[PDB]
Enzyme design. Structure first.
Site, short mmCIF file in Angstrom:
data_model
loop_
_atom_site.label_atom_id
_atom_site.label_comp_id
_atom_site.label_asym_id
_atom_site.label_seq_id
_atom_site.Cartn_x
_atom_site.Cartn_y
_atom_site.Cartn_z
N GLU D 117 0.83 -1.20 0.00
CA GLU D 117 0.00 0.00 0.00
C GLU D 117 0.87 1.25 0.00
OE1 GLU D 117 -3.76 -2.12 0.26
OE2 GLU D 117 -3.04 -0.30 -0.69
N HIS D 141 -2.52 2.21 8.65
CA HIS D 141 -3.66 1.46 8.17
C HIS D 141 -3.79 0.21 9.01
CE1 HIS D 141 -6.42 -0.87 5.78
NE2 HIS D 141 -5.50 -1.74 5.40
N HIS D 143 -6.95 -2.99 10.35
CA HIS D 143 -8.26 -3.58 10.15
C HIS D 143 -9.06 -3.49 11.45
CE1 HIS D 143 -6.53 -6.03 6.52
NE2 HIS D 143 -6.48 -4.72 6.34
N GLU D 171 -15.15 12.51 23.46
CA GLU D 171 -13.88 13.02 22.95
C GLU D 171 -13.74 13.04 21.41
OE1 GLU D 171 -11.41 9.87 24.58
OE2 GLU D 171 -12.48 8.48 23.28
N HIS D 212 -13.13 -3.29 4.82
CA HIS D 212 -11.69 -3.48 4.82
C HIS D 212 -11.01 -2.88 6.05
CE1 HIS D 212 -7.74 -3.49 2.27
NE2 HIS D 212 -7.47 -3.56 3.56
O1 2HA Z 1 -3.92 -4.36 4.96
C1 2HA Z 1 -3.30 -4.67 3.95
C2 2HA Z 1 -2.13 -5.60 4.05
O2 2HA Z 1 -2.42 -6.81 3.35
C3 2HA Z 1 -3.59 -4.22 2.74
O3 2HA Z 1 -4.65 -3.35 2.54
ZN ZN Z 2 -5.75 -3.72 4.65
#
Ligand code: 2HA
Ligand code: ZN
Ligand code: 2HA
Ligand code: 2HA
Ligand code: 2HA
Ligand code: ZN
Ligand code: ZN
Ligand code: ZN
Lengths: 274, 274, 274, 274
Positions: D117, D141, D143, D171, D212
């Site tokens: 990414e 990033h 999940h 908050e 995602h």
């Molecule tokens: O989170 C990720 C790693 O595989 C990709 O979006």
């Molecule tokens: Zn991801």
């Protein structure tokens, strides 16, 4: 004496904040914790103090706290980080002789200051000192997840909320027979919310801030953490039960009365009357 | 021999209580644990005993436990703290020759006493000794979250509760084929609740206290912890399933019967008949 | 060479079992794990082997595994304990020259034996060796909580279950494009369930045992653990979504097709067709 | 100077990835993290660099990042493993003088490369540098479980999603007054999704990828982790509330306005208008 970082109170602050972090109650800088000490607790560690302690005024006079030392969490500081750098995230402060301000004897390095909820904390300590003849020494605020969730679904009423929490785990009435006070939503970090919290603390050891979190008071770190953990455990049980369609059975009024009699506590009347 | 703190039984008590703390089953002083030892287990550690062990009477005579040593958790003590100070939070006690009281050979410092559920524990040990020809050695009580939640929504009936728990994880019937006894709600910490629990222990290795928690019995700490963890895992699965609208399919009676036959256990008849 | 306990494979087995314990997937003795090694992996540690390795026959001939070494978890052993005593809870076994039995080269002390699901494991290894030209080396079984819960509410059908899991996290189709096979409920620990699992392993890297758990296959411990963790994460998301009233929107067939094209995988046709 | 593994930035990357692993936000290789450094941060550690740093081109020119060093997670690498082998799972890269590619100064051993990414990361850094006058230095990033679940049930609209998240913890409006941008579902790992994310980053510090996960930006690792943890905590509360039948009461528009005024932030107008 050993270094102050190894003192019972610094170690206790690390344990409580770290435990609360692990519980998921203190994302980011959420939550704050203050513990009232005695001069005898800190005096042996004088060699570890700042040579020239910083002075900061209080937002309002608190003569009841004159000359009183506390260990506190810092403004903007993360509970998760306390264990990594106690001196950066905690401070020992001593309130001056007129209760007008305090000196930072140890910690709060790099111009850190005590928690922005200091009014709620110090005003609540004052009311709890009065209500418990000086036995209570801790005010803890955290973002207890299930309690927060319940403030969106249960009536935000002391009697109703107290009664549901008592029902959610047998021990609850014994641990908080005075119940749980609940404020209306208010802007946090103000003198007003601090004063409102302290007023509730006159009658309860737990106070809820709707859509925000909880404040608890107790004589020691463990007892105060345990108080909140008990209420939050009951809330966790309730969230599960409500998610499954609600109670088909529960602890009855008669059972709560018997419980109170056995443990020598008098349950909050309004919650019992429901 | 090495220090008693490093003994298998002290270490085992630390592991079980710490694990249960991490599971979220033991907020505050919730839960208690007792393990029956043999004289040969503790004799090598005589040098670590208190020079003048304190004596405390039992609430009722328990001649079956005459001269029997146990390691136990203390009253008001937190499972979370056992690892931090084993001697403060645990004690080794030895019941006297008439089963009238016990001496505190080690631990329970600062005038601590054994768990306030000692009647439930010791009376249950007695019934489990009889029911298993001396194989069972542990009684564990904790506030297993999902099991507690289920007591507000499932019929508080041994057959029904047992059957749902068997359905919630395939292994359950094999781990507790005798099922789960459930008492009516009762005031905790009494001789009455202890006696009621012990009666259920004649027929089951697991007993539920509605709106409170669970008691389990087994031959070792791991097997007893594992027994409770199994029932609680099934309960966790059930809470999810019930929250999603209930079972669309499940383990059938015929499947449970086949399972029992394969593993050489005879399932509680009442639960199987549903 | 360093002691075998410090080897990559013993350490890897400790990591995987401990991680799974922490996930809440392996209460009591639930779950089992086997890893296929090469002679070159264990040969350097010959000095650490038992002087006279015990021999145990397999339940059926597995000539494809002739002379093949594996590290395995033991029957009745707890994942939680692997880190505390690797040699007690794990064993290195080497299948003999006709695939009729194996010698226990290391571990499984005190007359322990390999997991009671050895048929499911070894038969699945055989089918995965064939299906992946020898790339897959791990079979892992655990009691993944959300996946288990879903088996009570979703249709126990490969296409439907696969499709929901793909929808529950974008990465899923990429991680398991072959989908998830699901067996009917069967009595565990048998040759029959082992054979049934191995058959599903011909077409899928994940196989569900309704009301019980999951089996996964992969080339390394991390990839296999990660495979299961991915499916279980998606299941966790789904349980939340279903508890909130179901999907209002989701990943579409067209999106899944685009995803498969980008990552060069061909999605299980039956699941894609829904 | 001490070894680079002990540097604040390597240690910080270990802490953030490990913490996110423990939160359950980073199964398998899910998630990625990049931190913009200054030359002065890495210069002292020149002795620890690869003797002949590998060169890799970027997918598109990024002149704004010319000569800029970053520490990044690797493609296919697991957050869980960063603490076990920082050099295998992380890399320090320095973008060349035309922003056409970078050299791997440290780490990413065994031919590892930065996260797949990287376009989303580096393009977002560029837009955040512009939007914050160089203050933002981290793109994270993960999940985040509850946020993901909410994308299946809430309208995938910036105003609506922002408003619900603000309501879910007091908050939130203070921590992300600019709100949360939400993209349509897109195939991950592409220049297109990277560009789409960067566009949202012009107006928001948080961006959701439906079905995602989430991307966050901030000045430090802790502030960025804390930003995501705050949004995810609110999402966790919301999932509980929605599972219990929805809000009976909540934070009002008037309360949000008062909150914004007190903390000197201007709330995203569209979310406030609901
Ligand atoms: O989170 C990720 C790693 O595989 C990709 O979006
Ligand atoms: Zn991801
Ligand atoms: O929890 C707080 C810390 O930001 C304030 O109420
Ligand atoms: O769990 C208990 C400890 O307070 C009592 O039942
Ligand atoms: O998980 C198992 C271990 O008891 C068997 O299926
Ligand atoms: Zn707060
Ligand atoms: Zn109890
Ligand atoms: Zn199993």
């Amino acid at each position: 004496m050993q270094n102050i970082t190894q003192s019972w109170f610094v170690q206790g602050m690390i344990k409580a904040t770290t435990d609360a972090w692990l519980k998921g109650w203190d994302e980011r800088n959420g939550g704050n914790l203050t513990l009232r000490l005695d001069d005898a607790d800190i005096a042996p560690y004088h060699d570890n103090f700042h040579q020239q302690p910083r002075y900061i005024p209080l937002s309002q006079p608190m003569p009841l706290l004159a000359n009183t030392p506390f260990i506190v969490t810092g403004s903007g500081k993360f509970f998760r980080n306390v264990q990594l750098d106690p001196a950066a995230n905690l401070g020992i402060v001593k309130v001056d002789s007129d209760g007008a301000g305090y000196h930072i004897l140890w910690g709060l390095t790099n111009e850190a200051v005590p928690t922005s909820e200091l009014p709620a904390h110090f005003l609540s300590h004052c009311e709890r000192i009065k209500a418990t003849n000086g036995k209570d020494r801790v005010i803890m605020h955290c973002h207890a997840t299930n309690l927060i969730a319940l403030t969106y679904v249960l009536e935000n009423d002391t009697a109703v909320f107290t009664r549901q929490l008592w029902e959610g785990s047998t021990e609850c009435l014994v641990v908080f027979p005075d119940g749980v006070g609940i404020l209306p939503w208010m802007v946090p970090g103000t003198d007003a919310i601090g004063q409102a919290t302290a007023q509730e603390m006159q009658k309860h050891s737990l106070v809820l801030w709707p859509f925000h979190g909880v404040f608890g008071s107790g004589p020691t770190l463990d007892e105060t953490f345990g108080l909140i953990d008990t209420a939050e455990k009951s809330a966790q049980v309730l969230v599960k039960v409500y998610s499954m369609g609600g109670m088909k059975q529960t602890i009855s009024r008669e059972e709560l009365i018997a419980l109170g009699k056995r443990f020598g506590v008098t349950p909050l009347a309004s919650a019992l009357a429901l």
